[PDB]
Design a protein around this ligand. Structure first.
Ligand SMILES: COC(=O)C1=C(C2=[SH]CCC2)C[SH]=C1NC(=O)[C@H]1CCCC[C@H]1C(=O)O
Length: 135
């Protein structure tokens, strides 16, 4: 087993959100999409198979799935249809996901906090916090 397995693997449901509309604005999402995307309550499924981590997000609005090896950059088409270059590392027990596109950068941090998985999303000055519980 591994730290990653024990901490993150499983099925998680969104239970609260803060500032997500403002985060979406900062990453360039337009009005109609922000409105419909902001209603979504995704399930997040995290799995590990050997060195490969998979993060799936499933909702009424969009489904996404990424698989990656820690430290190894990959192509990602985000839920909001940005084509980014992503690298995910495990830093002091926090999954740190950096996305680069068009000269811009956003960082998504995923951490365990008590029984929750807390996702912090930062674009320039704007932070959104997305809190998940076990499904
Ligand atoms: C920018 O859009 C997004 O980031 C975004 C979505 C859209 S689709 C159209 C508009 C917005 C849908 S789901 C999502 N982001 C996440 O699910 C992760 C990954 C990053 C931030 C929040 C995280 C979270 O666990 O909720």
């Amino acid at each position: 087993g591994s730290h990653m397995c024990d901490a993150f693997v499983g099925t998680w449901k969104l239970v609260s959100s803060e500032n997500f509309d403002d985060y979406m604005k900062e990453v360039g999402v337009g009005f109609a999409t922000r409105k419909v995307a902001g209603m979504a309550k995704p399930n997040m499924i995290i799995s590990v198979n050997g060195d490969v981590i998979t993060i799936k997000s499933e909702s009424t609005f969009k489904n996404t799935e990424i698989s990656f090896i820690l430290g190894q950059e990959f192509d990602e088409v985000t839920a909001d249809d940005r084509k980014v270059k992503s690298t995910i590392t495990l830093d002091g027990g926090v999954l740190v996901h950096v996305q680069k596109w068009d000269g811009k950068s956003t960082t998504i941090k995923r951490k365990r906090e008590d029984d929750k998985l807390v996702v912090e999303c930062v674009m320039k000055g704007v932070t959104s916090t997305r809190v998940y519980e076990r499904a």
